[PDB]
């Protein structure tokens, strides 16, 4: 069931509907990758809904009130007072994805310097850390464990929060590597496993309880920590009655610090935030708003405008309205619930995305030939719809052969920028794919044609078979 | 078929949902009157599409670039070049309903001492005249004359152009009146005429062939220029591949002015134009711009604001969007249709609005009790929709013996704001009146406990009988 | 002295920088008519000060906030919140010069119904009426009758209230007209005599002391109600250590309405208020509110955008602002005191405008040749100045003789547009005035080319002689 | 002579005005440390320029036309067409201080695969390098050398073009190091040596000459492009007939890419650009729009929201404006000026800064005693202006030693951000230096009362001695 718009749209951005003759140009000016295709050209652009989501009243109007000033900016206080207000956190740095490259080698540092850690032997744990999160750990030389629960990408298995940790694995994990050598834990809410899964407050106060004993730092990576707390709110039933604001200040007594891309739940276009619960973590933010300046090895300034932190500053509330996450989380599941009406199956769908199986829909086509990057040109040419491969396209070549890397399975993500499509729209998709899989049989495969030798989904350039 | 929007909601004013029981209660406090009501109260508020719509991107911004110069503003500049060049119009009087109050008196002031009207016989004629612009027009003493065709009105009976105007009735009405006392005629595109009926190119023309014939001055009342030259498009063969803009060039040949409130396809919330041609009508251009400073019998001075004046001059572009326009159309259609399937009875509807009947629906409430007030009340306390009577109660009481007015029907009026609201809300709106039809039996009559001497519709409270 | 500006500019508006050739022929174009040149031809625009000021960044961001309902809007709220807790009335309308056209009448016809007020007898009063004021007044067949102050008009006479009612001849005007037949009496603040000239409180006190002994109803003209306020808080050593704020409160117990252009002091491009301050006056609130729909003698609608009543609802506290109100009485008298300085004399010089005699300026030309109007185009030319001229140009003809009508004085009227311009432009202005007077000699009187029947000085074009 | 600017002010942040008591108490709280006083507290904030000045109304317009799409925005196309239209250079990469970090490395790797570059023996040259240019050079392994003129730092001694390139230096460099060993020249405009001196068109030639001689890339730091060909306009007597559009296409005819923070003369509160000239740099535009995603050693996302690209498309514009530049560069010189009127003496200023020499003005202060931030402080309490000081109390303590670091000189440093204050706040500081020059004997020196162990400068606190 669509909910309708808990909301009176106000401002809209014209689309041009285009010919099936237009789009058939176009894509093959873009090489068969909608990656190069103008904006203007797609009519619906589910690329990614990072920053791509709609603003409020309130929102909009906060950019024109901004204090550009470097340092005592009252545009700063308010955004530090929202912080305190809604997550309880005493101490705010504003970033322009929550400055992971910051948090990580202050923590790894910090417990080196405190509990012998030793670099050789750290490990840091999460219910599911992020590409990114990942990465910047594993730059630092740390390494990376998910501690998942089982039901977590098992589909065909309801469960109301696969994004859970894995309580016991945490122990033992934690145990095995030596607490010395665990520089922090991030729980990331919602989970980004199995296309986004929420974790449930009694987990998250377990983990904390867990990471307390041991000491060890607990960082809340999130980006979509308000579509988490309307999860608790709908399916655990200790919070029933509780508001997203109450369940939001409960939630993060389990953290001692956070991290996150304000281009998610915030609603806003750019943005994120790293901030500290108390002095118990005082030193944690001296050294990380120090190293904030002197991250290339001296100092270099900038950072967001007056009106960018007034805006998520009135953004990081209005991303809790209840009625607007009831509305979006229920927009996803009708989406998703429509594709598996018409028999289209996905590997995995949840909260972030739905991960349509290109393989499965057009199984003739060889993996080689990128049948989800087929999937994502068909569904631009029939639908206008923009989507992003997530298989061997993506995946590339291996740097040490130049051979195409193995993969698991061909994917074509589906991502809903925020307040910004209807149930039409979603409507409009789900045809579309009805149309596909009815013509799936006659899509051909790709093959290159211009091809660089990294990031090659961005800019090469393919013709068909 | 509800079309996809042809755009991305970029802006958006949160509306709470509430509960019943919060309805119920909010009704009574205001008196069973929906106009007494609190619009943060209103979920979906059918009262208006007068400046209530959304706006676009660019049009938005252009409020930012305006130049508050008391003359030679480039904005005003830059609203004269749009009219220029979409109306082919080289004089523009920015006006903030397109100032009837003004033409009017001008016009038949020319005619007086041009050709010897006569102020006691003289008669204008429109093929449906506004109910303001028969104000006016009465005001000055002068009778009016709607001139439409017998398909009209005429439900059940399906004819392209309903707005027409009856060239023979025209034709026959000049010549009973005499042509020295017509001082103008006036084209209302879309006509106004059984909830809102489109005017062909043909017919235009034809009616223009007439007026230049007599030498009498034509008006083109342009509040919905824009949805008129779509269903042009759509039903005029001549035109079916011509674009909103040639359209709207073409048709306003066949005026020597123009007069329009641009709070409805303008897409504005505030603002009007009073227009001329070319030199022909240039001392009917400055008599106006003359009047416009002195109608109050002496200097007055004001205007919009400059970055208004620049919003509407591009208002009137983004308005004429031949994806947007289908898909305005096309949504107000589905509504109409979807209430039509359910059993619901329009004694009209239309372009403009659809006048459900509630006397049919709620048989059983008096004329007196106010069947069509009762049914807005209903609807409120349902789905958190408010709409308009438009029957006994707002015709009011015989203001020489106090006794209420005698009404041909108790109608309720919707009217959909533009860009406002989507598929969803237009099903709510039609799963309400199912609701409310299937519980027909159990809706109320009203009565007075509070009552105006004058325009009691607005404040009057009523309670259940 | 000029102070330094209580505010950092944030947003500016670009005006080229023209040659004195360029200015040559642009005067010429526009027939030696200052209203006939383009905004951007003009370096420093002193037509007008109404609407044309900048407004803060909270004002500005109002804008996007708007609530577009037509009834029970939360903006329309806000604006009403915003007059209950600055001037303490509780019923507001929202305009778009106070709608005077409709209090005016409510007011001659309530005092008709209750004490039998005559018609052929009625007259109202004000220390002074502004313009349209009386216009209205007069219009609706009420004589009007200024009772200011002796000092009022005597220049070279300093005294810190030159707008003050004259107390006795108040009192003498109501006993020689009859208590019943005075409508109300208009408290205008600041004053428009000599220029603009501070009310006190002691004597709006004593005003409202005599208007309540003979009920008769008080309506407070506040345009410059801050202006007002700033003077009283200088002048009146009672007022000294009160805020703004708190003599606007007290200042507003002495009237039973209020009605105002937010124009001016209240900072906006558009906009006004018609406000009650409490159920004594409901009733006349009621009429007002009905008028309002009505005035064309049938029901007519439209009002403020939301956004417009949410700017106003900030704007009437920033006008308010102490260092904004010094810094910009301070501008306007350091131009002044430069002009004074230079050996410029000015008939009348106050806080809304300074009126120069161009006759005195330029001696060698003939009034009927328009000194002020040869100054106007002198200014423009060297230093891109526009300024209007009130004089005979202006005066124009007698409607039944067609000869000139005979003028006391030709003056040059400056405004300065609030936050506007800087200290050096005030000195840009003296220094153009300086060239001018050195060069007096030389400047030609001018002759009509064009010339209009009425309101002649928009749009007449001359030449030189 | 300060200029009248050559715009309207349209939009302002109040700012209070305090008390001497109120900054007394203001300083104490903040620990004689003026980062650490709130923004609302500074009356004149001259902390730095960067991001701080003012927007036209197109580019605070431009913020609302944003095209939020991750790939082919309209809103990147219309900035990277501004580039090719205003510098000429076909691609562009908008950066979020213009992306240093990004072509340094892929410049060095460039030559060392195609002539041998020895790492171990590189060199960059400049007319003198931006701090964080010089850092990113050097963290990369890469000596830098300015090679500025013997009149850049020479005061006393007027010249042209002080930020000159010392050509034969250039060529003895280059030929000393080995041609292969050089990985690119940046050529910085305006220079900022010598608080900010301009670079001659010819002297740009004659670089580029030499460098394109020996294959070297040439990279146009451009943070101040527009006041570079204000000066060059000015000065440079070839070009004083051609508009600044003009000059800045033909300036950089002599580099092959431009890197830029827009916060400075593109005027925007953040983002950046790093472009390249024609195909002949299209690898070097390929490697850097490769390693701007996987800098971090892995994929990262993010970039400047479209409202943004949009308004520094506009900015680029408005940025040359010639009135406008006019306008500032009068203002600053009109600052330094006044300042050494009084007897006020400074060891460098230019376009870009005003270095006070506080040793000289209050000799009694040892530097330990940090005399710079005790005349920040002395600013402060006597006028509300905000400084930052560059001396000992910035240098900071030696990292080996943790003894405190020897300073040439003890300087206060002043920066006007762009279009916010006027020539009456100019007037302002220049009166708070008479007075404090005239206090200067009772000015105290500082100590410590709490010291961070880095970047003391932002949150030490102190009290007087
Ligand atoms: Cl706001
Ligand atoms: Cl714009
Ligand atoms: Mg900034
Ligand atoms: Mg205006
Ligand atoms: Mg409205
Ligand atoms: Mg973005």
Redesign the interface.
């Known amino acids: 069931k669509?909910?309708?718009?808990?909301?009176?749209?106000?401002?809209?951005?014209?689309?041009?509907?285009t010919t099936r003759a237009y789009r058939e140009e176009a894509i093959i000016k873009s090489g068969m990758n909608p990656?190069?295709?103008?904006?203007?050209?797609?009519?619906?652009?589910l690329?990614?809904d990072?920053?791509?989501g709609?603003?409020?009243?309130?929102m909009?109007?906060?950019?024109?009130?901004?204090?550009?000033?470097?340092?005592?900016?009252?545009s700063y206080?308010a955004l530090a007072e929202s912080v305190k207000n809604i997550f309880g956190y005493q101490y705010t740095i504003p970033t322009?994805?929550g400055a992971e490259?910051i948090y990580i080698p202050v923590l790894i540092k910090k417990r080196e310097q405190e509990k012998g850690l030793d670099r050789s032997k750290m490990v840091a744990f999460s219910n599911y850390f992020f590409?990114?999160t990942q990465?910047?750990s594993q730059?630092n030389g740390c390494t990376v464990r998910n501690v998942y629960i089982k039901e977590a990408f098992d589909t065909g298995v309801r469960y109301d929060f696969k994004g859970n940790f894995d309580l016991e694995g945490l122990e033992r994990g934690i145990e095995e590597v030596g607490p010395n050598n665990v520089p922090y834990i991030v729980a990331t809410i919602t989970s980004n496993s199995a296309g986004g899964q929420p974790v449930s407050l009694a987990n998250l106060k377990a983990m904390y309880s867990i990471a307390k004993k041991y000491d060890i730092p607990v960082v809340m990576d999130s980006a979509r920590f308000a579509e988490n707390a309307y999860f608790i709110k709908q399916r655990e039933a200790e919070y029933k009655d509780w508001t997203i604001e109450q369940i939001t200040r409960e939630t993060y007594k389990y953290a001692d610090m956070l991290a996150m891309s304000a281009?998610k739940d915030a609603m806003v276009?750019?943005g994120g935030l790293l901030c500290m619960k108390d002095d118990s973590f005082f030193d944690v933010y001296?050294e990380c708003r120090?190293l904030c300046?002197?991250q290339?090895?001296?100092?270099?300034?900038?950072?967001?405008?007056?009106?960018?932190m007034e805006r998520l500053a009135v953004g990081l509330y209005?991303g809790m309205?209840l009625?607007?996450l009831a509305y979006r989380i229920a927009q996803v599941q009708y989406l998703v619930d429509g594709l598996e009406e018409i028999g289209v199956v996905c590997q995995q769908a949840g909260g972030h995305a739905a991960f349509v199986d290109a393989g499965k829909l057009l199984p003739h086509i060889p993996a080689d030939q990128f049948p989800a990057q087929a999937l994502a040109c068909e569904l631009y040419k029939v639908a206008g719809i923009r989507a992003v491969e997530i298989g061997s396209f993506l995946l590339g070549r291996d740097p040490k052969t130049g051979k195409q890397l193995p993969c698991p399975a061909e994917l074509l993500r589906l991502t809903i920028?925020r307040?910004?499509?209807?149930?039409?729209?979603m409507?409009?998709i789900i045809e579309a794919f009805k149309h596909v899989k009815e013509n799936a049989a006659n899509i051909k495969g790709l093959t290159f044609t211009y091809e660089?030798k990294?990031?090659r989904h961005?800019t090469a350039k393919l013709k068909e078979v």
Not at 35 to 45: G, Q, R, T, Y
Not at 66 to 71: F, M, P, R, V
Not at 296 to 308: D, I, S
Request: aromatic content about 12%.
């Open positions: 669509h909910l309708p718009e808990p909301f009176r749209i106000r401002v809209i951005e014209p689309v041009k509907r990656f190069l295709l103008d904006s203007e050209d797609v009519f619906i652009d690329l990614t990072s920053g791509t709609a603003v409020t009243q309130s909009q109007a906060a950019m024109m009130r901004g204090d550009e000033a470097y340092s005592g900016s009252r206080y322009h994805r490259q590409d990114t990465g910047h730059i281009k276009p750019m001296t120090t300046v002197v290339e090895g001296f100092p270099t300034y900038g950072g967001l405008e007056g009106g960018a209005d309205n009625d607007w920028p307040a910004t499509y209807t149930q039409t729209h409507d409009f660089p990294v990031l961005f």
